Amino acid sequence: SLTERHKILHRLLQE
Amino acid sequence: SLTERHKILHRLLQE
Amino acid sequence: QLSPEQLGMIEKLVAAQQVTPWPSREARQQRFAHFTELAIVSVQEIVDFAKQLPGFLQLSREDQIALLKTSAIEVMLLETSRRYNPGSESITFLKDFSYNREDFAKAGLQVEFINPIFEFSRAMNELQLNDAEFALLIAISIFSADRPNVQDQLQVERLQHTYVEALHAYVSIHHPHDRLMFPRMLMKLVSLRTLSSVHSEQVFALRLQDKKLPPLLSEIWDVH
Amino acid sequence: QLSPEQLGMIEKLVAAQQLRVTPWPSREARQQRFAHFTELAIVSVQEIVDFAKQLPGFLQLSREDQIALLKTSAIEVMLLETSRRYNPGSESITFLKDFSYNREDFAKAGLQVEFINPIFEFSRAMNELQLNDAEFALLIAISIFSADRPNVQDQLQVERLQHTYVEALHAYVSIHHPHDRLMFPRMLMKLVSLRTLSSVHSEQVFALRLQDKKLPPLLSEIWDVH
Ligand SMILES: CCCc1c(OCCCSc2ccc(CC(=O)O)cc2Cl)ccc2c(C(F)(F)F)noc12
Ligand SMILES: CCCc1c(OCCCSc2ccc(CC(=O)O)cc2Cl)ccc2c(C(F)(F)F)noc12
Questions:
Q1: Considering only CA atoms, which residue is closest to atom 7 of ligand 1?
Q2: Of A7, D37, D171, D192, which has the fewest CB atoms closer than 10 Å, so is most exposed?
Q3: Cα distance between residue D65 and residue D155, in whole Å
Q4: Which of A1, A2, A8 has its CB closest to that of D217?
């Protein structure tokens, strides 16, 4: 997935 | 110029 | 409301718009040659159509070449999508044999470019554009003031508006209940710029595997 | 005809848009300008994430699609926001609502003239359209909701969301520009130019590769090919 490759962006989306 | 570097296209535009 | 002037221009464009055959290492080369020669025919067609578009031949010859050089791939891609057969998932060139994702790849194209061609043609075909609408996307595609090396950017942008307005008026006749068909048509021009750049990677790939484009296609496409 | 629902979506877009950065100052002063530039980009991305989160429809997309769309539109939104900070008089761009940067300052920060020049040419062209806050907001919504980005799964819903904003824009611009029927299309056509710039950018990111000049982690993640 992109999610597994985009941790920082994913965390910005989570927070 | 673009014209001297594009001799086939130019001739087509001319004819 | 479609003006008389827009009416006449739209019919002019529609009227305006209206080889090594296909079979080992020679097998590969004569498919590529057939394919690149089909393009040579398209670029001769585009140049002729372009010469009949109001305003085009009034531009400096240098600007005409600026416009046709970069927009050709985009116009080749629009034409291609006109010829998409949604049932067979094929593109019928010359009106005989039809080509599919692997015919393209036997003809030398890398799958990174073929997949977008067909996915763009699947999307274009969903809108069900008729001739007049393809003719005018093709005009707007050509009159892009943001191409490298355009000089009179202001007049290329002015010319483009006359076509964009023409398409607006027309699509309001073609599709009187769906106000979104017009911007859905324009937005497809956004995708074409990505396919234009997907195509630059193709051409560079052909350099790496030292494949040689013919004179007219090397002229408009190769980075000299 | 702007409906009550569009009226209220646009006002939310406008309201959604309304600091430790290495300052602007020899290999040391050179790496620091780059670091200042790259850290502005990071501020923008963070800004683009929190803006997207407020886009009606956005958080209902699967997380993957959220990331697929922000990944690729981040540069185009950065160019849209650069373009609104353009001073046509000095041909500079005022970042930080403070310090103004011109083509030459862009080049001192590590960027190449093949990308700089188009940035400024696009900014020049967007300035002539004189968009207001809503028009910029709606254009950015429209850029973000592009169904054709690499790796978007629910293409159909992303497209359906884009048309809602496209129509809101249509409606809004008929009130703001009641006599120039071209202003709507002139604004959409700017999304065409931004695809080209997004491509020129990828070459910039590749030029950074070949001269071994490291992007910080957040931008390496979104822009570098792994
Ligand atoms: C779409 C582009 C596909 C494409 C080529 O396709 C040729 C067929 C599509 S263009 C075309 C040609 C003849 C007709 C004739 C008719 O309708 O009668 C109509 C069209 Cl549309 C041929 C060469 C290349 C290359 C390259 F790298 F080799 F240069 N990249 O992409 C290519
Ligand atoms: C347009 C591209 C801008 C760009 C960079 O940013 C300069 C302006 C960033 S956009 C921006 C940031 C903060 C604010 C908030 C505030 O004004 O305070 C407002 C804006 Cl508009 C920084 C690095 C790169 C690169 C690269 F490759 F070097 F990393 N390519 O493009 C880059």
A1: C39
A2: A7
A3: 9
A4: A8
CA of C200, nearest ligand number:
1
Q: How many distinct helices (H) and strands (E) make up chain B?
A: 1, 0
Task: Please give the distance of CA A1 from its chain centroid, rounded to a whole number.
Answer: 10
Does an H or E element contain C146, and which? none
Q: Of the candidates D203, D208, D222, D82, which has an alpha carbon nearest to the alpha carbon of residue D150?
A: D222
Pair C47, C123: CB distance under 8 Å = no
- Cα D4 vs. chain centroid, distance in angstroms? 28
* Resolution, angstroms, 1 dp: 2.3
Shortest CA distance to D58 belongs to which of D143, D132, D135, D131? Answer: D143
Would an 8 Å CB–CB cutoff place B15 in contact with chain C? no
Residue D112 phi, psi (nearest 5) = -110, 150
- Per-domain residue ranges for chain D? 1-226
Side by side, the strands of the sheet bearing C98-99 are C84-85, C90-92, C98-99
Residue linked to tokens 């003006």: C3
Instruction: Round to whole Å and give the CA distance between D70 and D77.
Output: 9
Element at C99 (helix H, strand E):
strand C98-99
Q: What is the fold, at CATH topology level, of the domain defined by C1-224?
A: Retinoid X Receptor (1.10.565)
Region of C150 on the Ramachandran plot (φ > 0 left; ψ -120 to 50 alpha; else beta) = beta
Cβ atoms of residues D103 and D141 within 8 Å? no
- Rounded CA-CA distance D65/A2 in Å is 9
Calculate helix-pair angle for D183-210, D155-176, nearest 10 degrees: 130
